[PDB]
Ligand binder design. Sequence first.
Ligand SMILES: Nc1ncnc2c1ncn2[C@@H]1O[C@H](COP(=O)(O)OP(=O)(O)O)[C@@H](O)[C@H]1O
Ligand SMILES: Nc1ncnc2c1ncn2[C@@H]1O[C@H](COP(=O)(O)OP(=O)(O)O)[C@@H](O)[C@H]1O
Lengths: 286, 278, 50, 74, 236, 81, 154, 353
Amino acid sequence: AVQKVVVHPLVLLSVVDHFNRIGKVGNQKRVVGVLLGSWQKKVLDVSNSFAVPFDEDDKDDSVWFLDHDYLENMYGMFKKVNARERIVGWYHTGPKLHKNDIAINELMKRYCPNSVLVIIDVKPKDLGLPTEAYISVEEVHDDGTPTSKTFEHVTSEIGAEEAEEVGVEHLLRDIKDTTVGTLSQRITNQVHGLKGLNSKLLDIRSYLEKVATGKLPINHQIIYQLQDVFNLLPDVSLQEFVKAFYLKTNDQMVVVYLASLIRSVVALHNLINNKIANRDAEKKEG
Amino acid sequence: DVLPPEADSSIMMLTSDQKPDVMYADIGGMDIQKQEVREAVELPLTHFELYKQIGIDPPRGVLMYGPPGCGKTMLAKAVAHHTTAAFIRVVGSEFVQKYLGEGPRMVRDVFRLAKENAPAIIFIDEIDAIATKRFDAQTGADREVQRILLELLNQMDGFDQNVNVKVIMATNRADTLDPALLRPGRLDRKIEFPLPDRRQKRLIFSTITSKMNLSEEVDLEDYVARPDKISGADINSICQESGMLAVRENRYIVLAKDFEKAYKTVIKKDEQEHEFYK
Amino acid sequence: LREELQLLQEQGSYVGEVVRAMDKKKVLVKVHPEGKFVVDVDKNIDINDV
Amino acid sequence: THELQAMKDKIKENSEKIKVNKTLPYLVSNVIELLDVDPNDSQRKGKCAVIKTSTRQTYFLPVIGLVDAEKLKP
Amino acid sequence: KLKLKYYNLMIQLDQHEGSYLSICKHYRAIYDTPCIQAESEKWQQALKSVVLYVILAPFDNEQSDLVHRISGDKKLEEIPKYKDLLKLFTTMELMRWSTLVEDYGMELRKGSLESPATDVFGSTEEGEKRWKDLKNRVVEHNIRIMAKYYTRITMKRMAQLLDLSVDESEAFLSNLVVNKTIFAKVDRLAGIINFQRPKDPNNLLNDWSQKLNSLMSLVNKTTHLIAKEEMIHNLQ
Amino acid sequence: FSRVQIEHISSLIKLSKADVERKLSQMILDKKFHGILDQGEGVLIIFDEPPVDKTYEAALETIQNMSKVVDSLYNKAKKLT
Amino acid sequence: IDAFRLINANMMVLGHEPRQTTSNLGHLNKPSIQALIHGLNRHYYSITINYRKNELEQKMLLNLHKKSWMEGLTLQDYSEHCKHNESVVKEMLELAKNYNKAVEEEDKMTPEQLAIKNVGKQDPKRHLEEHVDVLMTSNIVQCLAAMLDTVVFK
Amino acid sequence: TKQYEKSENDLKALQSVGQIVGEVLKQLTEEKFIVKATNGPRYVVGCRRQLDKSKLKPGTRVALDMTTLTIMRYLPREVDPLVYNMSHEDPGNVSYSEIGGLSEQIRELREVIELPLTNPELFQRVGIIPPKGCLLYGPPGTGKTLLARAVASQLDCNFLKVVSSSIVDKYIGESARLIREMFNYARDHQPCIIFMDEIDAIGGRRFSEGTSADREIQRTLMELLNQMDGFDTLHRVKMIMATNRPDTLDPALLRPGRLDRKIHIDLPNEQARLDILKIHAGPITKHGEIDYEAIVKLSDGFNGADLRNVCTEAGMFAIRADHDFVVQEDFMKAVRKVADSKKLESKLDYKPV
Ligand SMILES: Nc1ncnc2c1ncn2[C@@H]1O[C@H](COP(=O)(O)OP(=O)(O)O)[C@@H](O)[C@H]1O
Ligand SMILES: Nc1ncnc2c1ncn2[C@@H]1O[C@H](COP(=O)(O)OP(=O)(O)O)[C@@H](O)[C@H]1O
């Protein structure tokens, strides 16, 4: 099926600028549009998209509709100008999908064999790479219930090709690039580490909160198996983990030995040559 | 930036480890013709220092001529056994192009691919195609490829001194070869085609039949005289012709009537009572 | 570098041979792969310099 | 069952684009023909063709486009 | 279809002296003739003769998917000897060699089809060659799993597990270690012998790349944790 | 097999233990055979730690870097006198 | 990109050289944009382009492409640097230490030659820095492996 | 209606531009490979991600992108002229027996060509090198072109005729390369056979050199030599050569190798002409009165076509009377008298060997 999707900055902005379109008039609900995907292989890619006016009542929180004439002739517009582009699904700005979002995909399954819905985020806050990806699939259940659709999460990544790189790479004008080797890896050690702390923290806060409030199910199903997967590896020594310690010490040997070698070479060349050209410039001019 | 340099472009060389190769030791009639190639190939390549000691500069001149009898191209296949270097099959007319500039894209590269991949050797088979004297500007490209022949005449002297080349040459007709092609420091050594003779005959008699089935019936000392009065030849193929006459049968060892049949098929004639009164 | 790397594409560059100069300040020069041109000063090097 | 006239309209509109993009014959050319398909190393399908020009050039193209291998050998 | 019957003539040549591997795919080529048949005894004896030569051929990667191609057919499982032959191959573990003699000693009395006993035990010298070959195949089947599980072992426990003398253990360990299928360590005087393990750089590939290969699942922990979490929370 | 008894490895090679110990130790003398024997309990063990490469790089640098400062002795002691 | 606007040919009566407040004009002309392009400066003229914010979207789309050099999720890619993490990253350290042996065996030939030619040929060969960055990956070695004490224990 | 939209969706694939042909020359790195356009500019580009350079190799016909010029697809072998030289077909086979004479011309060429193909062991049994070609000449008598044409569809196997005309190629007569371009598939489709009529006008002497159009000739000869002068083994191709005269070819061709054997035709004997009339008298039916030796004894010293055509012309001259069947009476007159006019221009037909 669909493993991972490539979300370019162009489609994300194409939702967010429409969040300015209906956002200046407001008010509630979300920005929904039709997603134009490009499938070269099992890995999915996204290039363009277009948004359609959408309203959803709360009464009746399950009522939703889109304009098919807009989806039809504009697809005829975008397929005309670009024959490689076709609709792989739809999208919305969330932030969290209400249970009614399933039937939208079930309606457009006539257009595409598998429609992947992309939740997006117009205002960056947390925790990381924005948006989200959900693919329409029927997993049934291990409990043998009548088949129901719980959308499986698709990992989303940001990328570009050529011209879409040109625009944004000039538009940054913000932080140093990269710089490779010094600030890069250590700031990533802060972000990936600390955002990994509050991720599982708030996620384990939901683990206990769902047991405290929100039952049923809730708990079951995956709770006992997933939590035991957390209890798979504690994981400490003795024994072989002690061997990995001084083996890792034996690994840092070579690299730091080489470090002292570069120290001697850099100090030799630079210091000797600089003092030469220094003492020479002083004794000749003075 | 330039290339490494280089993987270059065309051919290139090998032709031994990737085949073909043919043993020269079968034909010994050319020994005196190999006497040049003996001293003019091995030591010139393997010693550049001895030429400082003797006080004489190694020539790039080598010639070949006469075909048929051919020798030549197959004799260039010989030294590919022992000396390991480039071997490039090239004529005058195969590197003719639709564009004039490809010549130095070959021959200027040919030099920079040779001396950089040196030790290397290059033989141009039948160089006589590019020696034609001509005017019209349609040949102005060829005039430029004989200016390329001049441009390769120009930049081949950069081989002086040391590493590396063996300039070996062959033509069946010496007519249109320019004086600057035979220029001092270009061709200083001329090999012609010596005609095979009683030694070479008995050598070309023995070398062919020592492989194919031979008989006690076969006395080739009569044929070092009777057919030898004219040919000459191409006897090597004539030596194979009587072998090709065994395919008329159903045969194992070729007969004597096939020996003469090879002589009666090739060739005639005297010619004439016009020569009887002389 | 980038400016000369910007300058040199939209035009290219070549090398000519002057076969004559003009009273109008122009110069008779060939584009050697192609037919000839006739082009003008070129105010640094004058006509009498070449 | 009434969509056959609608499909007739989309093949009239797209063949009108075949009237503007045939794509028009203008430059004279000559052909070189071959059949190919690509296994890897996933699996895909298609075919290719070769062409000459009036400018002497030659090109490697997915099979014509518009008329097909029906005719001819080049 | 006489050319297909000539295969039954050539199986005598391929099976005659030195090749137990050449009969692998060719006994499946002679198996195509009973497919057109319209035969009973020759068909059933072709099923057993083609399923019973697995022990003959040495262990190889081709031998696994080979017996997996013939495995699953509805006609094959009708024979309890196939149930024992499949029992030893799948999941391995251990079974007493005397019980293997019981199931493979009754095949002479079994039948119906006498053809497997004709190809295997029909010849005295060839039968004994396949007796020692069977001994080498079952002990190598034991070594295959045990070597992957070592670490270390003891010599006396190897003697009682393999049901053969310690010198026979060193003999079977000798001709298996010259096959370089498993690199062993064998010292009988101290009693501590061992098989495997890497024997890797190992300070980079093994310790580093594998540990942080588990850290792949550690950094992917919360990723698929919140996934399956939302999955069970949404549907009920 | 690295660790092996000397008597049964002489049974595989079919030779006396006297010239098995001396020939194998002669193979250790040639360095082509990595390992060592044990005469007390009659054991032979194979072990290796091949790479010296980092020490080669180190030595090549610093041993020549001696002559480097010797070369700087010429210039920096020339300004003195 | 580029910019173009057609000047009015009916203005040949009056002058062709506006505007006033030359700020964005004189700054737009530069580089002077070659010759063939400014050959269109007769009968045409360019126009200035500025990027208006819209800072929130510009900032998120800034981080969107920063996912390349920073990390994919700001978590994954350098947790993928925790996946490989010296793995198989020592193989490229073996090629880097082969660049140590290669480059520094000809780097020890440089200072002696400097004493022969007396001295700098300008130069230096550069043949500078380099494996300092390999030692910055060693900072990735020490840091991310020091995370194991936090990963393994509780 | 639906199939028309399918051709529309066919056209939805055709807006994609066709790539540029290329020949991979050599390589530098995994992102850099020496390649040249057919018009001469040399480039180094990157590949696509499916290929390995084992699927490319240096000196390989390939294709490149139209913008990035990246290596994408390819085909190893192509050319225009090859297969289009194949399609000439001769009735017979049985035309073998329809050439009349002559045995040692007929039978020997079978041993010269056929047996080399099927049984090269009989060459190595004795140890004799295989003849790689054959030569006809003339024209005493005639049939050099038909006996070839007949054997082509007779000997069967694989054979490719070489049309001798168009090689000159107008501008840039370098087309001697095309012989290698043809020999390359002759090394591919091997075994295959080649007939050549007219090697003499492409056998130019450069005896006393002049003007221009001779230079392109002699240069086109140098490759033909070198192609047979290899450096290569062409044995699986059989080169058959016939023309007006075996004289001007210069001695380079005249030696074995290039010219493997000497075969020719002379004036067919009246005994063999007795048979040449049967194959002429077979397709024509008349009244049953015939003496074959009559025309053979009356009409003397002719050729198969010369006899036949005039023999049919006699039937055509005799059918001028509008009567259908004709006895040899008119033919003992017409063929007699008509060929007498035809033997007026038999002058100067005797050419050197
Ligand atoms: N019996 C025959 N019937 C018809 N044509 C014949 C016969 N014998 C020979 N020929 C003709 O002779 C031709 C070859 O001779 P060629 O040398 O080309 O003719 P010419 O001698 O007129 O130059 C063959 O193509 C064939 O048509
Ligand atoms: N050992 C030999 N000595 C002399 N001639 C030979 C020998 N072997 C082959 N030949 C003849 O030489 C011809 C090829 O010789 P080559 O030198 O390539 O021709 P050319 O001299 O015209 O370039 C063949 O036709 C063959 O008959």
